[PDB]
Amino acid sequence: TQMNLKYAISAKNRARTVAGVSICSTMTNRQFHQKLLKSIAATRGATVVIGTSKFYGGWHNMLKTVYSDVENPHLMGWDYPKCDRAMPNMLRIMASLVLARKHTTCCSLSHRFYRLANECAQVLSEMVMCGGSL
């Protein structure tokens, strides 16, 4: 996985970094996950709001849907300090497990395990070419 520096505008001097990923990983992941990703993105009115536009009243629709029958409603929001740099890998394994639960008939047990192993080997923990070294 190649490492690179970003070029944009923000409000603090801390640097930014994108990561280039090999291409075989991309083809395999697309063929494996694309249908579920599209199904998630298209659906409206759910707990996850990925793929919903803030224009044409979508923002109001979301703000109403979250406003369900709450007896003494309040609003609370939190933050994750360094979410990506401090993620425990057990939860990442379990997350990649949840997404695969839909593959009930398309894939066998051994095939599922090998796909999970590939995902862990390619994205979770592997060799990061930074600078000119590994």
Place this chain on the structure above:
RNA sequence: CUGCUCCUAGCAUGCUACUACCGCGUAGCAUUUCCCAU
């Protein structure tokens, strides 16, 4: 790298309307020709 949006251009399709000609089909109107031997 994913999602959202704008704009432009092209294509292609579908549908609608208009114009022309054609022939058809129908209807009406009206005419023109009018025939002979082995």
